[PDB]
Amino acid sequence: QPELTPAQRTEVELLARGRADKSRVLRDLKLPETPEAAHALLLRLGVWDEARTPYADRLRAALNAVELPVPDFDPAEERLDLTHLPTFAIDDEGNQDPDDAVGVEDLGGGLTRLWVHVADVAALVAPDSPLDLEARARGATLYLPDRTIGMLPDELVAKAGLGLHEVSPALSICLDLDPDGNAEAVDVLLTRVKVQRLAYQEAQARLEAGEEPFVTLARLARASRRLREGEGALSIDLPEVRVKADETGASVFPLPKPEMRTVVQECMTLAGWGTAIFADDNEIPLPFATQDYPTREVAGDTLPAMWARRKTLARTRFQPSPGPHHGMGLDLYAQATSPMRRYLDLVVHQQLRAFLAGRDPLSSKVMAAHIAESQMNADATRQAERLSRRHHTLRFIAAQPERVWDAVVVDRRGAQATLLIPDLAFDVQVNTPAAPGTALQVQFADIDLPQMRVRARSV
Predict the structure, then answer these.
(1) 57 is in an annotated binding site
(2) Distance (Å, rounded) from C-alpha 80 to C-alpha 60?
(3) Alpha carbon 301 to chain centroid distance?
């Protein structure tokens, strides 16, 4: 009903974005002067549609693509050619920022060399560069359901991504593993590979048809997971979904997890462990990922079990010197396979690259510094992602008023049981009896986007 002038609209839009604290307009309309009330009013007046999300804005997370010039790879740099080896960058469907590729060589006597290649980002982003500083400012790439704001420029992703060109450079980690999962040698070096891209599902079909390197990969993965599971590593694999949005609306379909998906993960886990080792031997400081023992032990693999397991998790501390990680069942570990989307990973590559022929890496001092500076930014960026995935997931829910969803009481607290809707990877508070594991169909009551809340009835 009320009609705002452009000037007034911008004022309320500024309050909704959290760039302001008051609004004469809202006051006059006798509404709360809150980013949420402004958001609601804009929606109500049609100035904004339900597809807009102000969370990245409020959290002050960058929404502009980094516009810095990106240098080319040095063509004179010496790299080992592994372009003759079958290599696969296996991912989810839709993602277009290939960060890694796997491969395997039979060395004989049952010794198999695992190859994990990663985008050679450090070759284009030296520490302290405009690129570096900007990546530190963001802490990580922001994956919104309707767009992706990279931690680095798109052009960088373009020439650095694995398998975006018939051939591509890469920083690789290789592990010589015996049938029993023991590594006899870990190596880290600059290479050139020709990767072939595939979706997890596609790789799974090739695994079922018994093709290589898929089969071998699966074997080494089953071996590596069992060792870690002997050392106390536990699994927190809850249902996951994909949230996408466009002009047609918001979508939330479950994410397939074939065995092959778990395999590539274990391979990443391996490169990380393998890199923690290499770093330790050469005294190279890294943002080692450490984690203590959980609040308590929790038995089972049911949802209510993994759900609790996740809340019990001890914090993850990044430090210049190595340290155990119980959650994973590893003495030392580092994340080194996603330098194109996680800042800490990029640092690992700057460190490795520095040592790998050249000047000294960063000291534990400046190291702890960049870890601290980036994490803060990474926290904001990730919260922005969560808040937006929630926003669009709500839309999706709203576009199916009648629909009934399957849930399972995963946790409780008084007459209030918190159940999870697997297909939505969503969870809502609901009072009922049902015990931690009881399935019950739910029906959502009345979405409110601004407040971003929902109540549910046990249909």
Answers:
(1) no
(2) 42
(3) 23
DSSP 8-state code for residue 298: -
Could you tell me the resolution of this structure in angstroms? Answer: 2.7
Q: How far apart are CA 112 and CA 116, in angstroms?
A: 13
Are the beta carbons of 117 and 337 closer than 8 angstroms? no
Q: Which of 84, 94, 74 is nearest to 115 (CA)?
A: 84
Which run of H or E residues covers position 10?
helix 6-16
For residue 361, give both structure tokens: 């890496």
Which residues does 332 contact at the CB level (< 8 Å), separation at least 6?
273, 276, 277, 280, 288, 322, 323, 324, 325
Claim to verify: residue 251 and residue 281 sit in the same structural domain: no
Please give the structure tokens belonging to residue 323: 């340290």
What is d(CA 397, CA 252) in angstroms, rounded to the nearest whole number? 9
Q: What are phi and psi of 371, to 5 degrees?
A: -65, -50
**191 HSE (CA, 13 A, CB side):** 26
Clarify whether residues 84 and 160 are in a common domain: yes
Q: Determine the Cα–Cα distance for residues 140 and 135; give it in Å rounded to an integer.
A: 7
Q: How far apart are CA 118 and CA 200, in angstroms?
A: 17
Q: For residue 53, what are the domain limits?
A: 1-60
Helix (H, G, I), strand (E, B) or coil at 134: helix
User: Are residues 412 and 380 located together in one domain of the fold?
Assistant: no
| Nearest-10 Cα torsion for 397, 431, 34, 16 | -20
* The one-letter amino acid at 364: S
CA angle 243, 262, 380 (to 5 degrees): 45
CB 345 within 8 A of CB 336: yes
Query: Would the annotation count 100 as a binding residue?
Result: yes
Method: X-ray
> How far, in Å, CA of 23 to CA of 43, rounded?
16
Give the number of C-alpha atoms closer than 13 A to the C-alpha of residue 321, restricted to the C-beta side.
1
Please provide residue 302's backbone torsions phi and psi, each rounded to the nearest 5 degrees.
Answer: -75, 170
> Which of 265, 94, 106, 122 has the alpha carbon at shortest distance from 188?
122
Residue 88 domain-assigned (yes or no): yes
- Do 105 and 231 have their domain in common? yes
Q: Please give the helix or strand (H or E) that residue 198 lies within, else none.
A: strand 195-199
| Residues 278 and 156 grouped into a single domain | yes
Rounded Cα–Cα distance for residues 150 and 70 (Å): 14
Burial of 84 (0-12, 13-18, 19+ CB in 10 A): exposed
Task: Identify residue 37 by its one-letter amino acid code.
Answer: A
- SS3 breakdown of the chain: % helix, strand, coil, rounded to 5? 35, 25, 40
Compute the distance between CA of residue 18 and CA of residue 54 in angstroms, rounded to an integer: 8
Residues with Cβ within 8 Å of residue 189, at least 6 apart in sequence: 79, 80, 171, 172, 174, 356
Three-state secondary-structure class, residue 12 = helix
